[PDB]
Write an enzyme that holds these catalytic residues in place. Structure first.
Site, short mmCIF file in Angstrom:
data_model
loop_
_atom_site.label_atom_id
_atom_site.label_comp_id
_atom_site.label_asym_id
_atom_site.label_seq_id
_atom_site.Cartn_x
_atom_site.Cartn_y
_atom_site.Cartn_z
N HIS A 18 33.35 -26.76 -6.36
CA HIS A 18 32.49 -25.64 -5.98
C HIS A 18 32.73 -24.38 -6.83
O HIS A 18 32.42 -23.27 -6.41
CB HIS A 18 32.64 -25.33 -4.49
CG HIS A 18 31.94 -26.31 -3.60
ND1 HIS A 18 30.59 -26.27 -3.36
CD2 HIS A 18 32.42 -27.36 -2.88
CE1 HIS A 18 30.25 -27.25 -2.54
NE2 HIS A 18 31.35 -27.92 -2.23
N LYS A 19 33.24 -24.59 -8.05
CA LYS A 19 33.61 -23.53 -9.00
C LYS A 19 32.64 -22.34 -9.09
O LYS A 19 33.03 -21.25 -9.51
CB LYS A 19 33.81 -24.11 -10.40
CG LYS A 19 34.84 -25.24 -10.48
CD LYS A 19 34.79 -25.91 -11.85
CE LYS A 19 35.93 -26.90 -12.02
NZ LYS A 19 35.96 -27.44 -13.41
N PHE A 20 31.38 -22.55 -8.70
CA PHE A 20 30.37 -21.51 -8.73
C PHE A 20 30.28 -20.71 -7.42
O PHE A 20 30.50 -19.50 -7.43
CB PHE A 20 29.00 -22.08 -9.11
CG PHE A 20 27.89 -21.07 -9.12
CD1 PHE A 20 27.88 -20.03 -10.05
CD2 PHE A 20 26.84 -21.16 -8.21
CE1 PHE A 20 26.86 -19.10 -10.06
CE2 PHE A 20 25.81 -20.23 -8.21
CZ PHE A 20 25.82 -19.20 -9.14
N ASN A 149 13.00 -20.61 -4.76
CA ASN A 149 12.52 -21.99 -4.66
C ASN A 149 12.35 -22.65 -6.03
O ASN A 149 12.57 -22.02 -7.07
CB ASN A 149 11.20 -22.04 -3.87
CG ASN A 149 11.12 -23.24 -2.92
OD1 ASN A 149 11.38 -24.38 -3.31
ND2 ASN A 149 10.76 -22.98 -1.67
N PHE A 150 11.98 -23.93 -6.01
CA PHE A 150 11.62 -24.70 -7.21
C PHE A 150 12.66 -24.77 -8.33
O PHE A 150 12.32 -24.90 -9.51
CB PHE A 150 10.25 -24.27 -7.75
CG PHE A 150 9.17 -24.29 -6.71
CD1 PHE A 150 8.76 -25.49 -6.14
CD2 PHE A 150 8.57 -23.10 -6.28
CE1 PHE A 150 7.76 -25.51 -5.16
CE2 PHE A 150 7.58 -23.12 -5.31
CZ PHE A 150 7.17 -24.32 -4.75
N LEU A 151 13.94 -24.68 -7.95
CA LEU A 151 15.05 -24.94 -8.87
C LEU A 151 14.90 -26.37 -9.40
O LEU A 151 14.56 -27.28 -8.64
CB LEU A 151 16.38 -24.80 -8.13
CG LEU A 151 17.63 -24.19 -8.78
CD1 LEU A 151 18.88 -24.77 -8.13
CD2 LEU A 151 17.69 -24.37 -10.29
N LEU A 435 9.05 -24.19 1.31
CA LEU A 435 8.26 -25.24 0.67
C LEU A 435 9.12 -26.39 0.15
O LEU A 435 8.61 -27.43 -0.29
CB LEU A 435 7.40 -24.66 -0.46
CG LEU A 435 6.48 -23.47 -0.16
CD1 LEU A 435 6.12 -22.74 -1.44
CD2 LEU A 435 5.22 -23.88 0.60
C1 MYA Z 1 19.77 -11.47 -4.09
C2 MYA Z 1 18.93 -12.51 -4.80
C3 MYA Z 1 19.81 -13.31 -5.74
C4 MYA Z 1 19.17 -14.65 -6.09
C5 MYA Z 1 20.16 -15.79 -5.96
C6 MYA Z 1 19.79 -16.72 -4.81
C7 MYA Z 1 20.87 -17.79 -4.63
C8 MYA Z 1 20.29 -19.10 -4.12
C9 MYA Z 1 19.97 -20.06 -5.26
C10 MYA Z 1 20.00 -21.50 -4.78
C11 MYA Z 1 18.81 -22.29 -5.31
C12 MYA Z 1 17.89 -22.73 -4.19
C13 MYA Z 1 17.71 -24.24 -4.22
C14 MYA Z 1 16.26 -24.66 -4.29
O1 MYA Z 1 15.40 -23.91 -4.73
S1 MYA Z 1 15.85 -26.18 -3.75
C15 MYA Z 1 15.42 -27.02 -5.24
C16 MYA Z 1 16.39 -28.18 -5.44
N1 MYA Z 1 15.62 -29.21 -6.14
C17 MYA Z 1 15.88 -30.51 -6.18
O2 MYA Z 1 16.83 -31.03 -5.62
C18 MYA Z 1 14.93 -31.38 -6.98
C19 MYA Z 1 15.11 -31.18 -8.48
N2 MYA Z 1 16.54 -31.22 -8.75
C20 MYA Z 1 17.16 -30.93 -9.89
O3 MYA Z 1 16.57 -30.60 -10.91
C21 MYA Z 1 18.67 -31.05 -9.89
O4 MYA Z 1 19.10 -31.34 -11.23
C22 MYA Z 1 19.40 -29.81 -9.36
C23 MYA Z 1 18.88 -28.51 -9.99
C24 MYA Z 1 19.23 -29.73 -7.85
C25 MYA Z 1 20.90 -29.94 -9.64
O5 MYA Z 1 21.21 -29.65 -11.00
P1 MYA Z 1 22.48 -30.29 -11.76
O6 MYA Z 1 22.83 -31.60 -11.10
O7 MYA Z 1 22.20 -30.27 -13.24
O8 MYA Z 1 23.66 -29.23 -11.44
P2 MYA Z 1 24.42 -28.32 -12.54
O9 MYA Z 1 25.52 -29.15 -13.18
O10 MYA Z 1 23.41 -27.63 -13.42
O11 MYA Z 1 25.13 -27.20 -11.61
C26 MYA Z 1 26.12 -27.57 -10.66
C27 MYA Z 1 26.27 -26.51 -9.56
O12 MYA Z 1 25.02 -26.21 -8.92
C28 MYA Z 1 25.08 -26.52 -7.52
N3 MYA Z 1 23.80 -27.09 -7.05
C29 MYA Z 1 23.36 -28.34 -7.27
N4 MYA Z 1 22.15 -28.48 -6.68
C30 MYA Z 1 21.84 -27.31 -6.09
C31 MYA Z 1 20.75 -26.87 -5.36
N5 MYA Z 1 19.71 -27.70 -5.11
N6 MYA Z 1 20.74 -25.60 -4.89
C32 MYA Z 1 21.77 -24.76 -5.13
N7 MYA Z 1 22.83 -25.17 -5.84
C33 MYA Z 1 22.89 -26.43 -6.33
C34 MYA Z 1 26.24 -27.49 -7.38
O13 MYA Z 1 26.79 -27.46 -6.06
C35 MYA Z 1 27.19 -26.99 -8.45
O14 MYA Z 1 27.87 -25.83 -7.97
P3 MYA Z 1 29.31 -25.89 -7.24
O15 MYA Z 1 29.06 -26.53 -5.90
O16 MYA Z 1 30.17 -26.71 -8.17
O17 MYA Z 1 29.68 -24.43 -7.16
#
Ligand code: MYA
EC number: 2.3.1.97
Length: 435
Positions: A18-20, A149-151, A435
């Site tokens: 959970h390094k992030f 959304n839409f990450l 969504l």
């Molecule tokens: C004040 C306003 C500030 C704004 C900030 C708002 C913050 C909220 C933002 C949150 C976003 C809202 C979410 C939505 O919109 S929900 C959209 C999620 N979408 C999907 O699941 C479908 C498409 N998926 C992908 O493209 C995957 O490759 C994803 C992107 C999911 C993982 O990609 P990948 O496999 O290449 O990962 P990495 O190696 O780059 O990165 C690894 C790190 O990321 C953490 N991770 C993995 N998945 C998610 C996830 N779904 N939310 C949050 N964090 C996630 C993970 O625990 C690890 O961190 P840690 O656990 O080690 O620490």
């Protein structure tokens, strides 16, 4: 240490077919909320930088205009090609330009916040991360914020730890605009759900759903019994039901306000972002129409009830018969059925709301069916737990975890009893629908 144990039990809970964040303003799993409020110490738009975070060599950020034709296309290519976790699942998200013209063109939207990442020379979009500003309502307190959304990251470079920087940049891009909180929802378990709901499915075309392997045949059931089981009528049932129109708003906006206020996590809708949300881009053929809004007008002109739903279809692969799947998702609804009562949980006020929710959402199913939808979705959120079981909304295995960025909150009920069953008893307190 203790938080890890709790994560497991919670993951064990949601487990199915959970390094992030270890350095982010979120609740941890152990943390019992003393007081609801900001985690991170009060910062200012000048305490936050104006440098878009550097990323690995060969990439660059890019703002994406929803008004631009080919910019929007890049997104709903990458999302469609990559959003489906498995490349062999035989189905894909089909995000259409009509869909994002609704969901990304939010009132108060700024193309700067529809962040992307491109490859330097080739101009290939390889990641997208959206944020649209809203005002939340966490247990009586008004929290001005944003919905992320839409990450999504290109299949070919996952495990590339890029999502941190994707969140870290949108963090900064919002932070410099006088906004410091966010609602965000995921299927996977992250450090500190405020609530969890469960996805449920209502057949509208069971014959089809079977032939695509989205539903199966239970022990001792004909392919026929199931057709006869989920079969719907052609016309909506309840008196004076009509499409939402420009004139209805002020009556509906009040009705939705009075109703929505029961929940502990609602979006505060401004009459204008409400109108953008429930009236879709005008003149679109039935297969393109994104939002579907409906309202009951009494003879006198009083608007009693309101419901809406949005279409996000799949594209289906490796199937001779079918090319795609019509997918409706239940959205925001309202009704005055329980207004005369003092208490939401008075057994007579519950039966009064219920029998209304049965009718309205039954009529939703007819209407969705009529719009060539195959499966109608609805979470255990809101007062949904009242009708789901009765309307053949058989359980689905999806779990939605609702998280708040930079704000403490005590567990809000999700409509799930500890054994994952639908909580007919207390319903749910989650008011927003992501969504
Ligand atoms: C004040 C306003 C500030 C704004 C900030 C708002 C913050 C909220 C933002 C949150 C976003 C809202 C979410 C939505 O919109 S929900 C959209 C999620 N979408 C999907 O699941 C479908 C498409 N998926 C992908 O493209 C995957 O490759 C994803 C992107 C999911 C993982 O990609 P990948 O496999 O290449 O990962 P990495 O190696 O780059 O990165 C690894 C790190 O990321 C953490 N991770 C993995 N998945 C998610 C996830 N779904 N939310 C949050 N964090 C996630 C993970 O625990 C690890 O961190 P840690 O656990 O080690 O620490």
């Amino acid at each position: 240490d203790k938080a890890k144990k709790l994560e497991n039990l919670l993951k064990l809970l949601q487990l199915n077919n959970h390094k992030f964040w270890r350095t982010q303003p979120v609740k941890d799993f152990d943390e019992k909320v003393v007081e609801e409020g900001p985690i991170d110490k009060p910062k200012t738009p000048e305490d936050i930088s104006d440098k878009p975070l550097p990323l690995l060599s060969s990439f660059e950020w890019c703002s994406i205009d929803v008004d631009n034709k080919k910019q929007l296309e890049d997104v709903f290519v990458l999302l469609n090609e990559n959003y489906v976790e498995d490349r062999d699942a035989g189905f894909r998200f089909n995000y259409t330009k009509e869909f994002f013209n609704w969901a990304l063109k939010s009132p108060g939207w700024k193309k700067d916040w529809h962040i992307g990442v491109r490859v330097k020379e080739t101009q290939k979009l390889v990641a997208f991360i959206s944020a649209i500003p809203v005002t939340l309502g966490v247990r009586g307190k008004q929290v001005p914020s944003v919905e992320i959304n839409f990450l999504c990251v290109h299949k070919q470079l996952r495990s590339k730890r890029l999502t941190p920087v994707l969140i870290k940049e949108i963090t900064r891009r919002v932070n410099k605009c006088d906004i410091w909180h966010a609602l965000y929802t995921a299927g996977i378990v992250l450090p500190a759900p405020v609530s969890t709901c469960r996805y449920t499915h209502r057949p509208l075309n069971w014959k089809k759903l079977y032939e695509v392997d989205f539903t199966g045949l239970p022990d001792g059931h004909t392919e026929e019994d199931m057709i006869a089981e989920n079969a719907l009528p052609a016309k909506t049932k309840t008196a004076g039901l009509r499409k939402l129109k420009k004139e209805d708003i002020d009556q509906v906006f009040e009705l939705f306000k009075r109703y929505q206020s029961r929940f502990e996590l609602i979006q505060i809708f401004t009459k204008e972002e409400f109108e953008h949300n429930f009236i879709g881009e005008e003149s679109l053929p039935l297969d393109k129409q994104v939002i579907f809004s409906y309202v009951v007008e009494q003879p006198d002109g009083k608007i009693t009830d309101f419901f809406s739903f949005y279409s996000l279809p799949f594209t289906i692969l490796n199937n001779t018969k079918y090319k795609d799947l019509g997918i409706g998702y239940l959205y925001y609804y309202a009704t005055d059925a329980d207004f005369q009562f003092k208490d939401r949980f008075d057994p007579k006020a519950t039966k009064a709301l219920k029998t209304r929710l049965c009718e309205l959402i039954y009529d939703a199913c007819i209407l969705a069916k009529n719009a060539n939808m195959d499966v109608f979705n609805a979470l255990t959120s809101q007062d949904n737990t009242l009708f789901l079981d009765d309307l053949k909304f058989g359980p689905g295995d999806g779990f939605l975890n609702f998280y708040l960025f930079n704000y403490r909150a005590k567990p809000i009920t999700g409509g799930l009893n500890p054994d994952n069953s639908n909580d007919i008893k207390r319903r749910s307190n989650v008011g927003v629908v992501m969504l």
